Design a protein around this ligand. Structure first.
Ligand SMILES: CO[C@@]1(CN2CCN3CCOC[C@@H]3C2)/C(F)=C/C[C@H](C)[C@@H](C)S(=O)(=O)NC(=O)c2ccc3c(c2)N(C[C@@H]2CCO[C@H]21)C[C@@]1(CCCc2cc(Cl)ccc21)CO3
Ligand SMILES: OC[C@H]1O[C@H](O[C@H]2[C@H](O)[C@@H](O)[C@@H](O)O[C@@H]2CO)[C@H](O)[C@@H](O)[C@@H]1O
Length: 518
């Protein structure tokens, strides 16, 4: 459970230029005598936060920037402190992608956007609209071909169509995300996902098509079109297909809006090799020579390094990548992105398979995407009003009727539990001996052990939160009132992470209000 000193272990996704990255490793070894091991484990973006939490895992993790804010919030990433001269070598917007709470938490590498990739021997002119693809598939089926195949197992690839007519993740306005405002189950998201489920119903696409199936069908010339990123171009070059890379089709006359990723390199907070990792990333990888070694293996897209991006900018495939990037949006890096992606992944798979309707599927995705913020609103307000004797005057905001009725229910059932179990609550309080901000952060491991060692039901959830309020009254008492909000975030995190699937099957806090209805 300790990262070894005097080497570098690196994790990067299996679709990226990991052999190219290993050659940059070898150059580092030649100068320093330090061995660089590059690994591409399956589901590395799920494995990282698990292994890093115990002070294990790689020295360096590569992913798109969207996952890095959760990593940072959980204390898993070393702060990045490049000097000016090095910061000035990368585009300022790429540094913005790896800024979390005013601190740089990664090195940006490259800008990725999806494009439409078409076979010019099947489709001299690619379609400008999604709406013309059914008619084009009918023409191509008559010659033993299909119009379009892309990965339907990862919401990344379907999001551009969902977003086109007004689906969104977290509303962005006046240079600010409203994390309360989620656009997964609106009329625009519904129209985009209904169009996708209609293509599958009409046998223009297959619900089971994944990355490998779509890639093989395009690269063998069986399908005229795919949707993929720059990393995919190497294998198409090898297939000798006469391909173009172009703007994604419009939907209802509006651009497809890809979620734009910055491939980023983070340093593990538990690494004893932080100076070696900084030296490797700044003076070996993020050079014209280091990025070229990776790019030549699998293309990176529009690199963060200004000197190299100027050389690659002339490539029409890159110009097309940035066209689809500027019609799209830079992904948020807020901790909730992980939950957003899980929720939308399940909705797309379930709608495509017929397991749920589009309305049922996006309903559950909206509930899943809102769950952390709504749970924190309820739990934070209950802890603080129990501590101080006075309620919060601030509007509840989005889904406010549910937050209000959940807080009302919690006051009734929670107060009942605190009273009937006052002796048991006092006994556990003294036994924990909670004195400061440090002791509060150690409760997280105890909460997970006890709250997860039992049945899932609303009764045990009321106990988690009610004991939370009991501790909050104590923290007010000992002039540790500034610990109540951190405590509320820790309780919320334990609840939503461990009971995510059960909470969504109950329709979240509406199920809570219903279950305890008098
Ligand atoms: C008897 O005393 C407890 C139970 N415990 C169980 C674990 N064993 C382990 C060995 O030591 C002794 C202890 C005793 C009590 F009163 C139970 C009455 C309830 C009503 C039940 C009938 S129930 O079924 O409905 N629910 C629960 O069993 C329950 C659900 C969530 C909780 C917890 C229980 N517990 C343990 C309860 C709290 C009071 O006494 C415990 C609290 C918690 C952990 C501490 C740290 C902590 C910190 C914060 Cl801020 C919030 C929650 C927690 C996590 O949440
Ligand atoms: O599908 C949800 C998924 O989307 C993004 O992951 C992309 C990644 O950004 C690309 O570099 C490429 O590897 O394909 C991945 C999709 O399979 C998000 O970055 C990721 O967090 C999210 O789970």
């Amino acid at each position: 459970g300790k990262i070894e000193e005097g080497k570098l272990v690196i994790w990067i996704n299996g679709d990226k230029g990991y052999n190219g990255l290993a050659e940059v490793g070898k150059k580092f070894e030649k100068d320093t005598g330090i061995k660089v091991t590059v690994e591409h484990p399956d589901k590395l973006e799920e494995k990282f936060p698990q292994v890093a939490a115990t002070g294990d895992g790689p020295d360096i993790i590569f992913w798109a920037h969207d996952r890095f804010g959760g990593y940072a919030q959980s204390g898993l990433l070393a702060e990045i402190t490049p000097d000016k001269a090095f910061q000035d070598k990368l585009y300022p917007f790429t540094w913005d992608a790896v800024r979390y709470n005013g601190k740089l938490i990664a090195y940006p590498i490259a800008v990725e956007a999806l494009s439409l990739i078409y076979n010019k021997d099947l489709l001299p002119n690619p379609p400008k609209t999604w709406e013309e693809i059914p008619a084009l598939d009918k023409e191509l089926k008559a010659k033993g071909k299909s119009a379009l195949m892309f990965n339907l197992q990862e919401p990344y690839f379907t999001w551009p169509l969902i977003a086109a007519d007004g689906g969104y993740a977290f509303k962005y306005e006046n240079g600010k995300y409203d994390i309360k405002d989620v656009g997964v189950d609106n009329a625009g998201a519904k129209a985009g996902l209904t169009f996708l489920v209609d293509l599958i119903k009409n046998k223009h696409m297959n619900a089971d098509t994944d990355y490998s199936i779509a890639e093989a069908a395009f690269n063998k010339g069986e399908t005229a079109m795919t949707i993929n990123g720059p990393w995919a171009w190497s294998n198409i070059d090898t297939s000798k297909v006469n391909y173009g890379v172009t703007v994604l089709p419009t939907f209802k006359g509006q651009p497809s809006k890809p979620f734009v990723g910055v491939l980023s390199a983070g340093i593990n907070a538990a690494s004893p090799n932080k100076e070696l990792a900084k030296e490797f990333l700044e003076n070996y990888l993020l050079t014209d020579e280091g990025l070229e070694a990776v790019n030549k293996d699998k293309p990176l897209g529009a690199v963060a390094l200004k000197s190299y991006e100027e050389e690659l900018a002339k490539d029409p495939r890159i110009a097309a990548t940035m066209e689809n990037a500027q019609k799209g949006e830079i992904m948020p890096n807020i901790p909730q992105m992980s939950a957003f992606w899980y929720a939308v992944r399940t909705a797309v798979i379930n709608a495509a398979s017929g397991r749920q309707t589009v309305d049922e599927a996006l309903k559950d995705a909206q509930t899943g995407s809102e769950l952390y913020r709504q749970s924190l609103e309820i739990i934070s307000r209950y802890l603080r009003e129990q501590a101080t004797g006075a309620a919060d005057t601030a509007p509840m905001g989005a889904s406010g009727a549910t937050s209000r009725k959940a807080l009302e229910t919690l006051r009734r059932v929670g107060d009942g539990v605190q009273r009937n179990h006052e002796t048991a609550f006092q006994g556990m309080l003294r036994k924990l001996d909670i004195k400061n901000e440090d002791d509060v952060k150690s409760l997280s491991r105890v909460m997970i052990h006890v709250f997860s060692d039992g049945v899932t039901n609303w009764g045990r959830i009321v106990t988690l939160i009610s004991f939370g309020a009991f501790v909050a009254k104590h923290l007010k008492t000992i002039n540790q009132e500034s610990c109540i909000e951190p405590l509320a975030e820790s309780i919320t995190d334990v609840l939503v992470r461990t009971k995510r699937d059960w909470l969504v099957k109950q329709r979240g806090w509406d199920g809570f209000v219903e279950f305890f209805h008098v």
